[PDB]
Design a protein that fits this description.
- With 282 residues, this protein is of the alpha/beta class.
- It has one domain.
- The chain is built from 7 helices and 11 strands.
- The strands form 2 sheets. The chain has a 9-stranded mixed beta sheet with strand order 1-2-3-11-4-10-9-8-7, with helices on both faces. A two-stranded antiparallel sheet has the order 5-6.
- A hairpin with a 3-residue loop joins β8 and β9.
- The longest helix has 18 residues.
- Its EC number is 3.1.3.48.
- Interacts with EPHA3 (phosphorylated); dephosphorylates EPHA3 and may regulate its trafficking and function. Interacts with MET. Interacts with NCK1.
């Protein structure tokens, strides 16, 4: 079916929970043996969210190559994404090692450091120009270059230096700061505006390594971001845009990381975002 009328049909029939449960039932199950090794326990935020072995990002290190991160490679859309958890106190150095090694140009953050009175990820970037951060375990230096605070998002320019080689690179930090503590946004307008600011920066383009996107677990809000982006690109590429099937695209992405889209409310919100975005594009 087309999307917008499928949407009204599910609203009128009140069947979002049933639709979402059939996605959960049909989703891929692949092994995640490396994530569950005892030596990696303090590298995982949640025991039930792990990268599959076949798609996990490997650190270029011989002692321990493990990080909770997955490569989502969308063949028809010609887009790739790295989805990861919010960094932990012991994995902030690993996180920036991955950004360096994968040649990424942008980091997309969809949570606040504290939500619901609890810590959702480490403070992993510097807040003042004159107070830079050094990660001694991975030999990287990180400096805040500039910061632009807007009503619904903040963009930061960061400098990452590989202290072994003295090479430097500019990284863009795109921080969506207004997702509510509970539920989903009432309108997709600010989330879509944010997506197109990330696009305009070059951070999603083939000249660069894959964008790194995270929230707390790296599956819910993060899944909404890449699902909306890929569906809108497919609608531009195909002769028949009404042929884009958001449930089929989501099951394709779940071949690469488990659990993407965590609630029926996030599923409905993803439909809303694609429907409303399709109109602005033209």
């Amino acid at each position: 079916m087309e999307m917008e009328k499928e949407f009204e049909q599910i609203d009128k029939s009140g069947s979002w929970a049933a639709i979402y449960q059939d996605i959960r039932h049909e989703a891929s199950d692949f092994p995640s043996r490396v994530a569950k090794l005892p030596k990696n326990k303090n590298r995982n935020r949640y025991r039930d969210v792990s990268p599959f072995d076949h798609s996990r990002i490997k650190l270029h290190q011989e002692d321990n190559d493990y990080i909770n991160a997955s490569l989502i490679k969308m063949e028809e859309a010609q887009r790739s994404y790295i989805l990861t958890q919010g960094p932990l106190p012991n994995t902030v150095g690993h996180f920036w090692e991955m950004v360096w090694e994968q040649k990424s140009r942008g980091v997309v953050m969809l949570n606040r450091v504290m939500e619901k009175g609890s810590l959702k990820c480490a403070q992993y970037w510097p807040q003042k120009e004159e107070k830079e951060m050094i990660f001694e375990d991975t030999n990287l230096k990180l400096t805040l270059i500039s910061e632009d605070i807007k009503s619904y998002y903040t963009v930061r320019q960061l400098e990452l230096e590989n202290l072994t080689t003295q090479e430097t690179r500019e990284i863009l930090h795109f921080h969506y700061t207004t997702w509510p503590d509970f539920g989903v946004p009432e309108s997709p307008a600010s989330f879509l505006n944010f997506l197109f600011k990330v696009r305009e920066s070059g951070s999603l383009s083939p000249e660069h390594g894959p964008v790194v996107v995270h929230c707390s677990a790296g599956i819910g809000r993060s899944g909404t971001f890449c699902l909306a982006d890929t569906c809108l690109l497919l609608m531009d590429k195909r002769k028949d845009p009404s042929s884009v099937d958001i449930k089929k695209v989501l099951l394709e992405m779940r071949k690469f990381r488990m659990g993407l889209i965590q609630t029926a409310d996030q599923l409905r919100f993803s439909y809303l975002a694609v429907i409303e975005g399709a109109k602005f594009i033209m």
